[PDB]
Design a protein around this ligand. Structure first.
Ligand code: CA
Ligand code: CA
Length: 633
Protein backbone atom coordinates (compact mmCIF):
# COMPACT_ATOMS: atom_id res chain seq x y z
CA UNK A 1 0.00 0.00 0.00
CA UNK A 2 0.92 3.69 0.20
CA UNK A 3 0.81 4.72 3.89
CA UNK A 4 -1.60 7.58 4.58
CA UNK A 5 -0.14 8.43 7.97
CA UNK A 6 -0.20 11.74 9.86
CA UNK A 7 2.38 13.85 11.66
CA UNK A 8 0.63 15.13 14.79
CA UNK A 9 2.81 17.83 16.33
CA UNK A 10 2.41 19.22 19.86
CA UNK A 11 3.86 22.29 21.50
CA UNK A 12 3.78 22.60 25.27
CA UNK A 13 4.05 26.35 25.75
CA UNK A 14 3.32 27.19 29.38
CA UNK A 15 0.95 27.03 32.32
CA UNK A 16 -0.34 29.42 34.97
CA UNK A 17 -1.54 28.86 38.52
CA UNK A 18 0.10 25.49 39.09
CA UNK A 19 -1.15 24.60 42.56
CA UNK A 20 -1.72 21.70 44.94
CA UNK A 21 -3.62 24.01 47.23
CA UNK A 22 -2.43 26.62 49.73
CA UNK A 23 -1.22 23.91 52.11
CA UNK A 24 0.23 21.60 49.48
CA UNK A 25 2.11 24.54 48.00
CA UNK A 26 3.52 25.66 51.35
CA UNK A 27 4.91 22.13 51.80
CA UNK A 28 6.32 22.03 48.28
CA UNK A 29 6.23 24.73 45.62
CA UNK A 30 5.24 22.90 42.41
CA UNK A 31 8.09 21.74 40.14
CA UNK A 32 5.94 21.32 36.96
CA UNK A 33 6.48 19.27 33.84
CA UNK A 34 4.02 17.93 31.29
CA UNK A 35 3.80 14.39 29.99
CA UNK A 36 2.10 13.34 26.74
CA UNK A 37 1.00 9.85 25.74
CA UNK A 38 -0.82 8.22 22.81
CA UNK A 39 -1.61 4.52 23.33
CA UNK A 40 -1.97 4.01 19.58
CA UNK A 41 1.64 4.50 18.48
CA UNK A 42 4.99 2.95 19.43
CA UNK A 43 6.56 4.56 22.50
CA UNK A 44 4.77 7.88 22.44
CA UNK A 45 5.39 8.69 26.10
CA UNK A 46 7.10 12.07 26.13
CA UNK A 47 7.67 14.73 28.79
CA UNK A 48 8.74 18.34 28.97
CA UNK A 49 11.55 19.24 31.33
CA UNK A 50 10.59 20.30 34.87
CA UNK A 51 10.91 23.72 36.48
CA UNK A 52 12.00 23.87 40.13
CA UNK A 53 9.48 25.75 42.29
CA UNK A 54 7.71 27.44 39.38
CA UNK A 55 3.96 28.11 39.39
CA UNK A 56 4.01 29.91 36.05
CA UNK A 57 6.30 27.75 33.85
CA UNK A 58 7.13 28.44 30.20
CA UNK A 59 8.34 25.26 28.46
CA UNK A 60 7.84 25.95 24.75
CA UNK A 61 8.75 22.39 23.78
CA UNK A 62 7.72 20.55 20.63
CA UNK A 63 6.83 16.87 20.38
CA UNK A 64 6.07 14.97 17.19
CA UNK A 65 4.07 11.77 16.73
CA UNK A 66 3.38 9.57 13.70
CA UNK A 67 -0.26 8.45 13.68
CA UNK A 68 -2.32 5.81 11.86
CA UNK A 69 -5.64 7.34 10.65
CA UNK A 70 -7.52 4.06 11.10
CA UNK A 71 -6.93 4.48 14.83
CA UNK A 72 -8.68 6.39 17.61
CA UNK A 73 -5.61 8.50 18.41
CA UNK A 74 -6.16 10.10 21.83
CA UNK A 75 -3.49 12.40 23.27
CA UNK A 76 -3.38 11.96 27.05
CA UNK A 77 -1.95 15.04 28.78
CA UNK A 78 -0.68 15.02 32.33
CA UNK A 79 0.47 17.86 34.53
CA UNK A 80 3.07 16.59 37.01
CA UNK A 81 5.01 17.83 40.06
CA UNK A 82 8.52 16.40 40.06
CA UNK A 83 9.47 15.06 43.48
CA UNK A 84 12.35 13.31 45.25
CA UNK A 85 10.28 10.19 45.84
CA UNK A 86 7.34 9.81 43.50
CA UNK A 87 6.30 12.50 41.05
CA UNK A 88 2.74 13.55 41.75
CA UNK A 89 0.16 13.74 39.00
CA UNK A 90 -1.77 17.00 39.34
CA UNK A 91 -4.14 16.52 36.43
CA UNK A 92 -5.04 14.31 33.49
CA UNK A 93 -6.47 15.78 30.28
CA UNK A 94 -7.68 14.03 27.12
CA UNK A 95 -7.65 15.18 23.49
CA UNK A 96 -8.94 13.37 20.42
CA UNK A 97 -6.95 14.14 17.27
CA UNK A 98 -9.95 13.16 15.14
CA UNK A 99 -11.66 16.41 16.17
CA UNK A 100 -8.95 18.05 14.08
CA UNK A 101 -8.35 18.10 10.32
CA UNK A 102 -5.15 17.83 8.27
CA UNK A 103 -3.34 21.16 8.00
CA UNK A 104 -5.41 22.62 10.85
CA UNK A 105 -3.06 24.36 13.31
CA UNK A 106 -5.22 25.21 16.35
CA UNK A 107 -4.40 25.88 20.01
CA UNK A 108 -6.41 24.17 22.76
CA UNK A 109 -6.58 25.52 26.37
CA UNK A 110 -6.72 23.16 29.36
CA UNK A 111 -7.89 23.76 32.93
CA UNK A 112 -7.02 21.57 35.90
CA UNK A 113 -8.76 21.87 39.27
CA UNK A 114 -10.58 24.91 37.87
CA UNK A 115 -7.52 27.04 38.68
CA UNK A 116 -4.33 26.22 36.80
CA UNK A 117 -4.26 27.01 33.06
CA UNK A 118 -2.06 25.28 30.47
CA UNK A 119 -1.65 26.14 26.77
CA UNK A 120 -0.92 23.48 24.13
CA UNK A 121 -0.58 23.86 20.35
CA UNK A 122 -1.94 21.12 18.07
CA UNK A 123 -0.93 20.39 14.46
CA UNK A 124 -1.89 17.72 11.95
CA UNK A 125 0.17 17.65 8.76
CA UNK A 126 0.59 14.71 6.37
CA UNK A 127 3.54 12.37 6.88
CA UNK A 128 5.71 12.46 3.75
CA UNK A 129 7.38 9.51 2.04
CA UNK A 130 8.66 6.72 4.32
CA UNK A 131 12.34 6.34 5.30
CA UNK A 132 12.00 2.77 4.06
CA UNK A 133 12.87 2.18 0.40
CA UNK A 134 10.34 -0.20 -1.16
CA UNK A 135 11.91 -1.57 -4.33
CA UNK A 136 13.55 -4.68 -5.81
CA UNK A 137 15.97 -2.59 -7.81
CA UNK A 138 19.46 -1.74 -6.64
CA UNK A 139 19.85 1.62 -4.87
CA UNK A 140 21.30 4.58 -6.79
CA UNK A 141 24.58 4.24 -4.92
CA UNK A 142 24.98 0.60 -5.96
CA UNK A 143 24.01 1.27 -9.56
CA UNK A 144 26.56 4.09 -9.63
CA UNK A 145 29.14 1.82 -8.04
CA UNK A 146 28.64 -0.71 -10.87
CA UNK A 147 28.72 1.85 -13.69
CA UNK A 148 31.83 3.40 -12.14
CA UNK A 149 33.61 0.07 -11.59
CA UNK A 150 32.67 -1.39 -15.01
CA UNK A 151 35.58 0.02 -17.03
CA UNK A 152 37.97 -0.75 -14.19
CA UNK A 153 37.01 -4.41 -14.54
CA UNK A 154 37.37 -4.42 -18.34
CA UNK A 155 40.85 -2.93 -18.09
CA UNK A 156 41.86 -5.28 -15.26
CA UNK A 157 40.30 -8.30 -16.91
CA UNK A 158 42.43 -7.60 -20.02
CA UNK A 159 45.70 -7.34 -18.09
CA UNK A 160 44.93 -10.71 -16.47
CA UNK A 161 43.63 -12.66 -19.47
CA UNK A 162 46.29 -11.29 -21.81
CA UNK A 163 45.71 -9.74 -25.28
CA UNK A 164 45.26 -13.22 -26.75
CA UNK A 165 42.37 -14.49 -24.60
CA UNK A 166 40.91 -11.01 -23.88
CA UNK A 167 39.67 -10.51 -27.45
CA UNK A 168 35.95 -10.52 -26.70
CA UNK A 169 36.36 -7.61 -24.28
CA UNK A 170 37.75 -5.00 -26.69
CA UNK A 171 34.27 -5.01 -28.21
CA UNK A 172 32.47 -6.35 -25.14
CA UNK A 173 29.33 -4.41 -24.28
CA UNK A 174 29.14 -5.43 -20.63
CA UNK A 175 31.97 -7.23 -18.83
CA UNK A 176 31.18 -10.19 -16.55
CA UNK A 177 30.07 -9.58 -12.93
CA UNK A 178 32.46 -11.54 -10.66
CA UNK A 179 31.63 -12.18 -6.99
CA UNK A 180 34.08 -13.46 -4.36
CA UNK A 181 32.53 -15.59 -1.57
CA UNK A 182 33.95 -16.30 1.86
CA UNK A 183 32.25 -18.87 4.08
CA UNK A 184 31.54 -18.68 7.79
CA UNK A 185 33.57 -20.69 10.30
CA UNK A 186 35.13 -18.62 13.07
CA UNK A 187 38.79 -17.70 13.00
CA UNK A 188 39.49 -20.57 10.62
CA UNK A 189 37.27 -18.86 8.05
CA UNK A 190 38.89 -15.55 8.97
CA UNK A 191 42.54 -16.53 8.69
CA UNK A 192 41.79 -18.65 5.66
CA UNK A 193 39.99 -15.89 3.80
CA UNK A 194 42.84 -13.51 4.56
CA UNK A 195 45.26 -15.74 2.63
CA UNK A 196 42.70 -15.95 -0.15
CA UNK A 197 42.39 -12.16 -0.36
CA UNK A 198 46.15 -11.74 -0.38
CA UNK A 199 46.26 -14.06 -3.39
CA UNK A 200 43.27 -12.51 -5.17
CA UNK A 201 44.84 -9.10 -4.55
CA UNK A 202 48.39 -9.60 -5.85
CA UNK A 203 47.14 -11.64 -8.83
CA UNK A 204 44.86 -8.86 -10.04
CA UNK A 205 41.79 -11.05 -9.54
CA UNK A 206 40.23 -8.63 -7.03
CA UNK A 207 40.36 -5.87 -9.62
CA UNK A 208 38.00 -7.95 -11.76
CA UNK A 209 35.50 -8.49 -8.95
CA UNK A 210 32.35 -6.45 -8.51
CA UNK A 211 31.51 -7.96 -5.12
CA UNK A 212 33.04 -9.55 -2.03
CA UNK A 213 30.42 -11.27 0.07
CA UNK A 214 30.77 -13.01 3.42
CA UNK A 215 28.98 -14.45 6.45
CA UNK A 216 30.00 -15.27 10.03
CA UNK A 217 33.80 -15.63 10.00
CA UNK A 218 34.72 -14.23 6.55
CA UNK A 219 32.81 -11.15 7.59
CA UNK A 220 35.27 -10.44 10.38
CA UNK A 221 38.11 -10.30 7.90
CA UNK A 222 36.19 -8.09 5.49
CA UNK A 223 35.40 -5.65 8.31
CA UNK A 224 39.04 -5.56 9.35
CA UNK A 225 40.33 -5.16 5.80
CA UNK A 226 37.82 -2.62 4.51
CA UNK A 227 37.96 -0.52 7.68
CA UNK A 228 41.75 -0.28 7.64
CA UNK A 229 42.92 3.33 7.19
CA UNK A 230 45.55 2.48 4.57
CA UNK A 231 43.37 0.12 2.50
CA UNK A 232 43.47 -0.16 -0.57
CA UNK A 233 46.79 1.69 -0.96
CA UNK A 234 48.18 -0.97 1.38
CA UNK A 235 46.75 -4.45 0.92
CA UNK A 236 46.35 -7.86 2.57
CA UNK A 237 50.17 -7.99 2.60
CA UNK A 238 50.56 -5.56 5.51
CA UNK A 239 47.09 -5.85 7.02
CA UNK A 240 47.43 -9.61 7.47
CA UNK A 241 50.68 -9.19 9.42
CA UNK A 242 48.61 -7.15 11.87
CA UNK A 243 45.86 -9.77 11.86
CA UNK A 244 48.52 -12.28 12.81
CA UNK A 245 49.91 -10.28 15.72
CA UNK A 246 46.35 -9.56 16.92
CA UNK A 247 45.27 -13.20 16.95
CA UNK A 248 48.46 -14.64 18.50
CA UNK A 249 47.39 -13.74 22.03
CA UNK A 250 44.37 -15.63 23.35
CA UNK A 251 41.30 -13.37 22.92
CA UNK A 252 39.47 -15.00 25.83
CA UNK A 253 42.23 -13.74 28.14
CA UNK A 254 41.05 -10.23 27.20
CA UNK A 255 37.84 -10.81 29.13
CA UNK A 256 38.91 -9.33 32.44
CA UNK A 257 36.65 -7.98 35.22
CA UNK A 258 38.00 -4.50 34.51
CA UNK A 259 37.56 -4.73 30.74
CA UNK A 260 34.18 -6.41 30.99
CA UNK A 261 33.15 -3.55 33.27
CA UNK A 262 34.09 -1.11 30.49
CA UNK A 263 32.05 -3.08 27.98
CA UNK A 264 28.96 -2.95 30.21
CA UNK A 265 29.53 0.77 30.82
CA UNK A 266 29.88 1.55 27.14
CA UNK A 267 26.81 -0.55 26.26
CA UNK A 268 24.69 1.18 28.86
CA UNK A 269 24.76 4.21 26.58
CA UNK A 270 23.00 2.21 23.88
CA UNK A 271 20.63 0.68 26.41
CA UNK A 272 19.97 4.06 27.97
CA UNK A 273 18.89 5.38 24.56
CA UNK A 274 16.17 2.77 24.37
CA UNK A 275 17.82 0.06 22.28
CA UNK A 276 17.89 -3.53 23.43
CA UNK A 277 21.27 -5.01 24.37
CA UNK A 278 22.15 -8.69 24.42
CA UNK A 279 25.12 -10.96 24.79
CA UNK A 280 25.85 -10.36 21.12
CA UNK A 281 26.70 -6.74 21.94
CA UNK A 282 29.30 -8.02 24.43
CA UNK A 283 30.60 -10.61 21.99
CA UNK A 284 30.72 -7.94 19.34
CA UNK A 285 32.91 -5.81 21.53
CA UNK A 286 35.29 -8.67 22.24
CA UNK A 287 35.66 -9.42 18.54
CA UNK A 288 36.15 -5.72 17.96
CA UNK A 289 38.82 -5.34 20.59
CA UNK A 290 40.83 -8.25 19.20
CA UNK A 291 40.55 -7.27 15.51
CA UNK A 292 40.06 -3.49 15.34
CA UNK A 293 40.95 -2.05 18.77
CA UNK A 294 42.43 1.04 17.13
CA UNK A 295 39.16 1.80 15.36
CA UNK A 296 36.35 0.59 17.61
CA UNK A 297 34.01 3.34 16.41
CA UNK A 298 34.07 2.36 12.74
CA UNK A 299 30.52 1.89 11.40
CA UNK A 300 29.11 0.04 8.39
CA UNK A 301 28.61 3.47 6.83
CA UNK A 302 32.23 4.52 7.15
CA UNK A 303 33.14 1.83 4.63
CA UNK A 304 31.61 4.08 1.94
CA UNK A 305 35.07 5.69 2.01
CA UNK A 306 36.65 2.73 0.21
CA UNK A 307 34.06 2.56 -2.53
CA UNK A 308 33.24 6.23 -3.35
CA UNK A 309 35.02 5.97 -6.74
CA UNK A 310 34.59 2.20 -6.98
CA UNK A 311 38.24 1.58 -6.03
CA UNK A 312 37.30 -1.72 -4.35
CA UNK A 313 34.71 -4.45 -4.90
CA UNK A 314 31.49 -3.70 -2.99
CA UNK A 315 31.55 -5.47 0.45
CA UNK A 316 28.45 -7.51 1.20
CA UNK A 317 27.55 -9.11 4.55
CA UNK A 318 24.56 -11.11 5.78
CA UNK A 319 22.57 -12.35 8.78
CA UNK A 320 19.12 -13.92 9.22
CA UNK A 321 15.80 -12.55 10.36
CA UNK A 322 14.25 -15.34 12.40
CA UNK A 323 10.48 -14.98 12.90
CA UNK A 324 9.32 -16.25 16.33
CA UNK A 325 7.06 -18.88 14.72
CA UNK A 326 9.18 -20.27 11.85
CA UNK A 327 10.43 -23.66 13.08
CA UNK A 328 12.79 -24.43 10.20
CA UNK A 329 15.62 -21.96 9.57
CA UNK A 330 15.99 -22.79 5.86
CA UNK A 331 12.82 -20.69 5.70
CA UNK A 332 14.12 -17.66 7.57
CA UNK A 333 14.70 -14.48 5.61
CA UNK A 334 18.18 -13.34 4.72
CA UNK A 335 19.23 -9.76 5.46
CA UNK A 336 21.84 -8.06 3.34
CA UNK A 337 24.28 -5.40 4.44
CA UNK A 338 26.48 -3.14 2.32
CA UNK A 339 28.00 0.27 3.06
CA UNK A 340 25.04 1.77 1.21
CA UNK A 341 22.17 -0.20 2.71
CA UNK A 342 20.60 -2.99 4.74
CA UNK A 343 17.43 -4.91 3.97
CA UNK A 344 15.50 -7.97 2.88
CA UNK A 345 15.78 -8.26 -0.91
CA UNK A 346 12.92 -10.77 -0.97
CA UNK A 347 10.41 -8.09 0.02
CA UNK A 348 12.19 -5.14 -1.57
CA UNK A 349 12.55 -3.34 1.79
CA UNK A 350 15.75 -1.39 2.49
CA UNK A 351 17.03 1.47 4.63
CA UNK A 352 20.27 3.39 5.06
CA UNK A 353 22.80 1.62 7.32
CA UNK A 354 22.48 4.31 9.99
CA UNK A 355 18.80 3.43 10.49
CA UNK A 356 19.26 -0.30 11.19
CA UNK A 357 18.41 -0.37 14.88
CA UNK A 358 16.27 2.78 14.93
CA UNK A 359 12.57 2.69 15.85
CA UNK A 360 10.02 2.73 13.01
CA UNK A 361 6.28 3.07 12.52
CA UNK A 362 4.50 2.73 9.19
CA UNK A 363 7.78 3.00 7.31
CA UNK A 364 8.73 6.22 9.10
CA UNK A 365 11.50 6.38 11.71
CA UNK A 366 10.06 7.62 15.01
CA UNK A 367 13.24 7.54 17.13
CA UNK A 368 16.70 7.63 15.56
CA UNK A 369 19.69 6.38 17.51
CA UNK A 370 23.35 6.76 16.69
CA UNK A 371 24.50 4.23 14.10
CA UNK A 372 25.60 0.88 15.53
CA UNK A 373 29.39 0.36 15.57
CA UNK A 374 30.67 -2.17 13.05
CA UNK A 375 31.71 -4.49 15.90
CA UNK A 376 28.06 -4.84 16.82
CA UNK A 377 27.24 -6.00 13.31
CA UNK A 378 30.31 -8.21 13.52
CA UNK A 379 28.74 -9.70 16.62
CA UNK A 380 25.40 -10.21 14.88
CA UNK A 381 27.07 -11.73 11.78
CA UNK A 382 28.83 -14.30 13.94
CA UNK A 383 26.28 -14.65 16.72
CA UNK A 384 26.61 -18.45 16.67
CA UNK A 385 29.53 -17.88 19.02
CA UNK A 386 27.45 -15.75 21.34
CA UNK A 387 24.74 -18.41 21.58
CA UNK A 388 27.37 -21.01 22.38
CA UNK A 389 29.80 -18.72 24.17
CA UNK A 390 29.80 -21.07 27.16
CA UNK A 391 31.29 -23.67 24.81
CA UNK A 392 33.86 -21.26 23.33
CA UNK A 393 35.05 -21.11 26.95
CA UNK A 394 32.61 -31.95 20.58
CA UNK A 395 32.63 -29.73 17.47
CA UNK A 396 30.59 -26.57 17.13
CA UNK A 397 28.97 -28.14 14.09
CA UNK A 398 27.86 -30.97 16.35
CA UNK A 399 26.44 -28.60 18.98
CA UNK A 400 24.70 -26.76 16.14
CA UNK A 401 22.69 -29.60 14.59
CA UNK A 402 20.87 -29.85 17.93
CA UNK A 403 19.92 -26.20 18.59
CA UNK A 404 16.25 -25.36 18.02
CA UNK A 405 14.72 -22.12 16.77
CA UNK A 406 13.18 -21.82 20.22
CA UNK A 407 16.60 -22.29 21.80
CA UNK A 408 18.09 -19.32 19.96
CA UNK A 409 15.30 -16.75 19.88
CA UNK A 410 13.02 -16.09 22.88
CA UNK A 411 15.07 -18.56 24.99
CA UNK A 412 37.55 -26.03 32.82
CA UNK A 413 39.35 -22.92 34.14
CA UNK A 414 37.93 -20.56 31.49
CA UNK A 415 34.38 -21.13 32.76
CA UNK A 416 35.04 -18.64 35.56
CA UNK A 417 35.08 -15.91 32.90
CA UNK A 418 31.58 -16.85 31.80
CA UNK A 419 30.40 -16.57 35.40
CA UNK A 420 32.25 -13.33 35.91
CA UNK A 421 30.67 -11.88 32.78
CA UNK A 422 27.20 -13.05 33.69
CA UNK A 423 27.67 -11.73 37.22
CA UNK A 424 28.68 -8.29 35.96
CA UNK A 425 25.70 -8.26 33.61
CA UNK A 426 23.03 -9.09 36.18
CA UNK A 427 24.69 -6.78 38.71
CA UNK A 428 24.27 -3.88 36.28
CA UNK A 429 20.92 -5.02 34.91
CA UNK A 430 22.24 -4.68 31.35
CA UNK A 431 19.90 -7.47 30.24
CA UNK A 432 18.26 -10.63 31.61
CA UNK A 433 20.78 -13.48 31.50
CA UNK A 434 17.89 -15.77 30.58
CA UNK A 435 16.85 -13.99 27.37
CA UNK A 436 18.09 -14.55 23.82
CA UNK A 437 21.82 -14.52 23.17
CA UNK A 438 21.20 -14.09 19.44
CA UNK A 439 20.88 -10.37 18.76
CA UNK A 440 17.87 -8.08 18.87
CA UNK A 441 16.77 -4.94 17.09
CA UNK A 442 13.74 -2.69 16.73
CA UNK A 443 11.37 -3.96 14.05
CA UNK A 444 11.65 -1.58 11.09
CA UNK A 445 8.54 -3.26 9.64
CA UNK A 446 6.43 -2.18 12.65
CA UNK A 447 2.83 -1.34 11.77
CA UNK A 448 3.32 -1.30 8.02
CA UNK A 449 0.38 -0.06 5.96
CA UNK A 450 -0.27 -3.45 4.31
CA UNK A 451 5.83 -9.50 10.13
CA UNK A 452 4.57 -6.01 11.02
CA UNK A 453 3.19 -6.79 14.49
CA UNK A 454 5.98 -7.21 17.07
CA UNK A 455 8.16 -4.49 18.59
CA UNK A 456 11.55 -6.15 18.16
CA UNK A 457 13.09 -8.76 15.84
CA UNK A 458 15.73 -11.49 15.98
CA UNK A 459 18.80 -11.35 13.77
CA UNK A 460 21.30 -14.20 13.87
CA UNK A 461 24.32 -15.84 12.23
CA UNK A 462 23.38 -17.05 8.74
CA UNK A 463 25.60 -20.05 9.43
CA UNK A 464 22.63 -21.51 11.31
CA UNK A 465 21.16 -22.52 7.92
CA UNK A 466 24.17 -22.89 5.62
CA UNK A 467 27.71 -21.54 5.50
CA UNK A 468 27.81 -19.93 2.03
CA UNK A 469 26.31 -16.42 1.56
CA UNK A 470 24.70 -17.31 -1.79
CA UNK A 471 21.47 -15.36 -1.19
CA UNK A 472 23.57 -12.19 -1.31
CA UNK A 473 24.75 -12.68 -4.90
CA UNK A 474 21.93 -14.70 -6.39
CA UNK A 475 19.81 -11.56 -6.12
CA UNK A 476 18.45 -11.17 -9.69
CA UNK A 477 19.20 -7.46 -9.85
CA UNK A 478 22.92 -8.05 -9.31
CA UNK A 479 23.28 -10.30 -12.36
CA UNK A 480 26.30 -12.18 -11.08
CA UNK A 481 27.49 -14.69 -13.68
CA UNK A 482 30.80 -15.87 -12.21
CA UNK A 483 30.85 -16.84 -8.49
CA UNK A 484 34.32 -17.62 -7.11
CA UNK A 485 33.44 -19.26 -3.75
CA UNK A 486 35.73 -20.21 -0.88
CA UNK A 487 34.51 -22.77 1.68
CA UNK A 488 36.01 -23.11 5.15
CA UNK A 489 33.12 -25.18 6.54
CA UNK A 490 34.18 -27.85 9.03
CA UNK A 491 34.16 -31.41 7.67
CA UNK A 492 34.15 -34.59 9.81
CA UNK A 493 37.56 -35.29 8.28
CA UNK A 494 40.08 -34.02 5.74
CA UNK A 495 38.84 -36.81 3.45
CA UNK A 496 35.16 -36.03 3.98
CA UNK A 497 33.33 -34.80 0.84
CA UNK A 498 33.02 -30.98 0.92
CA UNK A 499 29.57 -30.32 -0.56
CA UNK A 500 27.25 -30.34 2.44
CA UNK A 501 26.87 -26.56 2.52
CA UNK A 502 26.94 -26.15 -1.27
CA UNK A 503 24.09 -28.61 -1.76
CA UNK A 504 22.18 -26.74 0.95
CA UNK A 505 22.66 -23.48 -0.94
CA UNK A 506 21.60 -25.30 -4.10
CA UNK A 507 18.45 -26.40 -2.34
CA UNK A 508 17.79 -22.88 -1.10
CA UNK A 509 18.17 -21.53 -4.63
CA UNK A 510 15.67 -24.00 -6.11
CA UNK A 511 13.35 -23.29 -3.20
CA UNK A 512 13.43 -19.59 -4.13
CA UNK A 513 13.41 -20.11 -7.88
CA UNK A 514 16.90 -18.63 -8.37
CA UNK A 515 19.37 -19.82 -11.07
CA UNK A 516 22.00 -22.24 -9.76
CA UNK A 517 24.21 -24.60 -11.81
CA UNK A 518 23.34 -28.23 -11.15
CA UNK A 519 25.71 -29.76 -8.62
CA UNK A 520 26.17 -33.34 -9.80
CA UNK A 521 25.46 -35.80 -6.93
CA UNK A 522 28.60 -37.75 -7.84
CA UNK A 523 31.06 -34.92 -8.31
CA UNK A 524 33.13 -36.18 -5.37
CA UNK A 525 32.80 -39.90 -6.13
CA UNK A 526 34.23 -39.39 -9.61
CA UNK A 527 36.58 -36.54 -8.70
CA UNK A 528 37.92 -37.28 -5.24
CA UNK A 529 39.15 -34.52 -2.93
CA UNK A 530 40.34 -31.52 -5.00
CA UNK A 531 41.55 -27.98 -4.16
CA UNK A 532 38.54 -26.59 -6.09
CA UNK A 533 35.77 -27.71 -8.44
CA UNK A 534 33.97 -25.95 -11.28
CA UNK A 535 30.22 -26.10 -11.88
CA UNK A 536 29.26 -24.82 -15.35
CA UNK A 537 25.59 -23.95 -16.03
CA UNK A 538 23.92 -26.46 -18.38
CA UNK A 539 23.43 -27.09 -22.11
CA UNK A 540 19.69 -26.21 -21.90
CA UNK A 541 18.39 -22.67 -21.47
CA UNK A 542 15.20 -22.80 -19.34
CA UNK A 543 15.93 -19.37 -17.84
CA UNK A 544 19.55 -19.80 -18.90
CA UNK A 545 22.65 -17.79 -18.23
CA UNK A 546 22.62 -18.92 -14.62
CA UNK A 547 25.93 -18.33 -12.88
CA UNK A 548 29.01 -20.52 -13.12
CA UNK A 549 30.48 -21.45 -9.74
CA UNK A 550 34.12 -22.12 -8.89
CA UNK A 551 34.03 -23.86 -5.51
CA UNK A 552 37.31 -23.73 -3.57
CA UNK A 553 37.53 -26.01 -0.54
CA UNK A 554 39.79 -26.05 2.50
CA UNK A 555 42.15 -29.00 1.97
CA UNK A 556 45.92 -29.44 2.31
CA UNK A 557 46.85 -31.20 -0.95
CA UNK A 558 49.57 -29.89 -3.29
CA UNK A 559 50.71 -27.39 -0.66
CA UNK A 560 52.38 -30.34 1.11
CA UNK A 561 54.99 -30.68 -1.63
CA UNK A 562 55.11 -27.14 -3.07
CA UNK A 563 56.07 -23.76 -1.59
CA UNK A 564 54.52 -21.95 -4.59
CA UNK A 565 52.40 -23.07 -7.59
CA UNK A 566 55.23 -24.44 -9.71
CA UNK A 567 57.88 -24.47 -7.00
CA UNK A 568 58.51 -27.72 -5.09
CA UNK A 569 59.67 -27.83 -1.44
CA UNK A 570 63.34 -28.81 -1.23
CA UNK A 571 64.77 -28.46 2.30
CA UNK A 572 63.66 -30.79 5.10
CA UNK A 573 62.34 -27.74 6.95
CA UNK A 574 60.09 -26.72 4.04
CA UNK A 575 58.44 -30.14 3.95
CA UNK A 576 57.80 -29.86 7.72
CA UNK A 577 55.67 -26.70 7.99
CA UNK A 578 53.30 -28.05 5.34
CA UNK A 579 53.01 -31.46 7.00
CA UNK A 580 49.74 -31.01 8.88
CA UNK A 581 46.03 -31.84 8.89
CA UNK A 582 43.03 -29.57 9.38
CA UNK A 583 40.26 -31.85 10.64
CA UNK A 584 42.16 -35.16 10.85
CA UNK A 585 44.32 -34.02 13.76
CA UNK A 586 42.91 -34.52 17.29
CA UNK A 587 44.79 -31.53 18.69
CA UNK A 588 44.07 -29.16 15.80
CA UNK A 589 44.08 -25.38 16.25
CA UNK A 590 41.61 -25.13 13.37
CA UNK A 591 38.38 -26.18 15.08
CA UNK A 592 35.55 -23.67 14.80
CA UNK A 593 35.46 -23.05 18.59
CA UNK A 594 39.14 -22.04 18.78
CA UNK A 595 40.26 -18.43 18.78
CA UNK A 596 43.94 -18.54 19.75
CA UNK A 597 46.11 -18.89 16.68
CA UNK A 598 49.82 -19.05 17.46
CA UNK A 599 51.97 -17.75 14.60
CA UNK A 600 52.70 -21.18 13.12
CA UNK A 601 49.03 -22.10 12.99
CA UNK A 602 48.24 -18.72 11.41
CA UNK A 603 50.92 -19.01 8.74
CA UNK A 604 49.88 -22.56 7.86
CA UNK A 605 46.20 -21.86 7.23
CA UNK A 606 47.05 -18.49 5.69
CA UNK A 607 49.76 -19.76 3.35
CA UNK A 608 47.66 -22.81 2.55
CA UNK A 609 44.69 -20.87 1.17
CA UNK A 610 47.12 -18.40 -0.35
CA UNK A 611 48.83 -21.17 -2.30
CA UNK A 612 45.61 -22.99 -3.18
CA UNK A 613 44.20 -19.79 -4.65
CA UNK A 614 47.33 -19.06 -6.65
CA UNK A 615 47.80 -22.69 -7.65
CA UNK A 616 44.48 -22.41 -9.50
CA UNK A 617 44.43 -18.96 -11.14
CA UNK A 618 44.30 -20.64 -14.56
CA UNK A 619 40.95 -22.22 -13.62
CA UNK A 620 39.52 -18.76 -12.96
CA UNK A 621 41.10 -17.09 -15.99
CA UNK A 622 39.39 -19.88 -17.94
CA UNK A 623 35.96 -19.44 -16.32
CA UNK A 624 36.12 -15.71 -17.03
CA UNK A 625 36.96 -16.26 -20.69
CA UNK A 626 34.02 -18.65 -20.90
CA UNK A 627 31.94 -16.02 -19.09
CA UNK A 628 32.94 -13.42 -21.69
CA UNK A 629 31.96 -15.69 -24.61
CA UNK A 630 28.62 -16.23 -22.86
CA UNK A 631 28.21 -12.45 -22.73
CA UNK A 632 28.20 -12.68 -26.53
CA UNK A 633 24.60 -13.89 -26.47
CA1 CA B 1 9.14 22.26 45.05
CA1 CA C 1 7.91 18.69 44.02
Amino acid sequence: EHQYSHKFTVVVLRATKVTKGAFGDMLDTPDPYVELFISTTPDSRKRTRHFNNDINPVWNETFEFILDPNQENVLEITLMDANYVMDETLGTATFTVSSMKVGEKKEVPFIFNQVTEMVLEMSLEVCSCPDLRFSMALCDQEKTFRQQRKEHIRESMKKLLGPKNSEGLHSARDVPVVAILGSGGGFRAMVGFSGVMKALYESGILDCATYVAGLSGSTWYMSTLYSHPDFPEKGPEEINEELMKNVSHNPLLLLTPQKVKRYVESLWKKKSSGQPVTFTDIFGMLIGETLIHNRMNTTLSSLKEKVNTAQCPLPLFTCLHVKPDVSELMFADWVEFSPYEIGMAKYGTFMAPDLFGSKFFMGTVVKKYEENPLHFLMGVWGSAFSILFNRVLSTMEEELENITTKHIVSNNQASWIHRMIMALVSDSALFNTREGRAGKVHNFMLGLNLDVKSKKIHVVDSGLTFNLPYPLILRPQRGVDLIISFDFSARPSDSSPPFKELLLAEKWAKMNKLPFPKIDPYVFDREGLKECYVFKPKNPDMEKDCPTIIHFVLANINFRKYKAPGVPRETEEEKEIADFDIFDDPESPFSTFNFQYPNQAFKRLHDLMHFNTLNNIDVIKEAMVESIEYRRQ
